[PDB]
């Protein structure tokens, strides 16, 4: 029912649904199986980096995950997405696990989008670099969770620190994000989030995502491990 | 989540999204882009008719667009009506305004609906010329209102007379229409309405719609402009 | 909005919507237009007996129908179902009547589902030979009753046994049954019927299907006829 715009941050290598068989950086449009995807050197306990960059000049949506004394991961896909999203939106962070577990933790999270008219320009802007245990600016969906150590949890963490399996969650921003009206000849966005991704054993499991979707949503059922709390199914 | 089959009247070239660059008339079947459109000569502050047919026999639906001591636009697309929509639906006459203002006078709207089955017919008729305040065989929605000069006005309209930008109304017909079921050998249905499109500025905006819906339709959020009031995205 | 995967027995061609111009066994994704057909001699008023076999390993669906002293109709095609369905889903038996009449009676049914993980299996298995009024396991919907003769009727039946027509009726199994969660290295059902079809008339029309649908699941409207009960329109 809803529709999902999503840059997806990939840990496992789901082969039976689309996926490469190494951990991937992808562009997801309605769809798990991505539609472009690149070679990613997933880094077990590092703070990583990601940038997502989109304008409607471009219609092109752009992502680079980097590691400090490291690799770094570049996707970009042809979208238009004042054709494929409605007028308003909601942007947010979702994450997974499965069997294999990984802590989904984000340590910052700051967003901007513009919308220019045709005659000064429309913008919001929000930075976080503390989370907060009463942090009424967010929707926290299924297991996630703001304040331990000052950060956002979306994945389902123990009282020692160890990953919990079989978790999903999402944060939303409350506002929600104007990218289109009749009016308009440019729209924009950035997003910005630093994550930490670590796991005691040798595998961790499908990872983070930042997603745009319609303002009503919410988890779908059974979107736990492969499908990334974005997808009902693996079409 | 609504399965829409409209014909539209548009006045505005969205070529963004799909429309050629002049103003059209097109056939809609579950997409604003259309599936086949003809150059139409919009006429500023003039009276035009609508005329739509379709039969199952046939498997096309048709529609002309005429103007006085004027030019005629004429469409026709091959198209199985039963296969794409429930046995049951709901008739209406939809508009939009975006940035650019328009009227979305109707002065006059009639329906007819043939239904037939093995071994006479099954028919609803409906005829509207004036159109009253208390209106109980329609269902309002939007920004649609009825009894200003006996007429039907679509889009917002201030108290002088001059159309207001952003604005977005539908009508729709009280008692459902039956379309198919498993007895039947033809089905047929005969749609016409007089329309008044008016605009002070260069450019009018986007213009009005007859479609076919399923019992329960509602204006989607943000169908405002080049959605013309029947679609929730521009897929 | 629900997906539907079916194993159909169709007694009615219906070449308008893609049917072949016999009785034939079909397989259903998503659409009534089956993705596989094969050839199916009807016989009315005897016992029949349908086999739905699936794993994910062969990655096939596949369905024999038997009559005894009789032809024995066989259907296979290629379906990855954790793909196309959620992790939850219902199983059930779906039957409708048009204009033309059938009895869609169940004598018995039978349905087992595996679930092996990393690790010995996770199973269900139920088993009908006798059904009664007060039936707690079940699911009824529609025109549906259990109880007669110890039979499920999923159409409308009069008091001295005649079919009744422009009937819909489905019975859905209590539990939830789980098809996939990502520790899964093979899932596997094994589905089982036996029905009774008897018409007056020359013409039987449209027959009984089994369907995998997601938890929520409830008839279509208009549903009734060429439609199984399954598919809101005919896409
Ligand atoms: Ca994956
Ligand atoms: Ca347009
Ligand atoms: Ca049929």
Redesign the interface.
């Known amino acids: 029912?809803d529709?999902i715009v999503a840059v997806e941050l990939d840990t496992y290598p789901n082969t039976?649904?689309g996926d490469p068989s190494y951990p991937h950086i992808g562009i997801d449009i309605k769809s798990v199986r991505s539609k472009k995807t690149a070679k990613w050197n997933m880094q077990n306990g590092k703070v990583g980096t990601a940038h997502i960059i989109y304008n409607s000049v471009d219609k092109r949506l752009s992502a680079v995950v980097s590691y400090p004394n490291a690799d770094s991961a570049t996707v970009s896909y042809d979208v238009?997405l004042?054709?494929?999203?409605?007028?308003?939106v909601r942007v947010g962070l979702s994450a997974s696990t499965?069997?294999?577990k990984e802590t989904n933790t984000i340590l910052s999270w700051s967003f901007t989008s513009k919308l220019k008219s045709?005659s000064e320009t429309n913008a919001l802007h929000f930075m976080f670099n503390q989370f907060s245990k009463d942090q009424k600016d967010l929707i926290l969906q299924g297991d996630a969770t703001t304040g331990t150590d000052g950060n956002l949890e979306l994945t389902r963490v123990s009282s020692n620190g160890s990953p919990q399996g079989?978790s999903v969650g999402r944060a939303l921003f409350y506002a929600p994000v104007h990218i289109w009206?009749?009016?308009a000849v440019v729209a924009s966005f950035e997003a910005t989030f630093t994550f930490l991704i670590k796991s005691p054993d040798s595998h961790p499991?499908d990872g983070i995502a930042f997603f745009i979707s319609?303002?009503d949503s919410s988890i779908?059922?059974?979107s736990?491990?492969?499908l990334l709390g974005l997808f009902?199914?693996?079409?």
Chains 1, 2, 3 share one sequence.
């Open positions: 029912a529709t039976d649904i238009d004042d054709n494929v999203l409605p007028e308003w499965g069997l294999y045709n079989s009206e009749s009016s499991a319609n303002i779908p059922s059974g736990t491990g492969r009902p199914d693996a079409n």
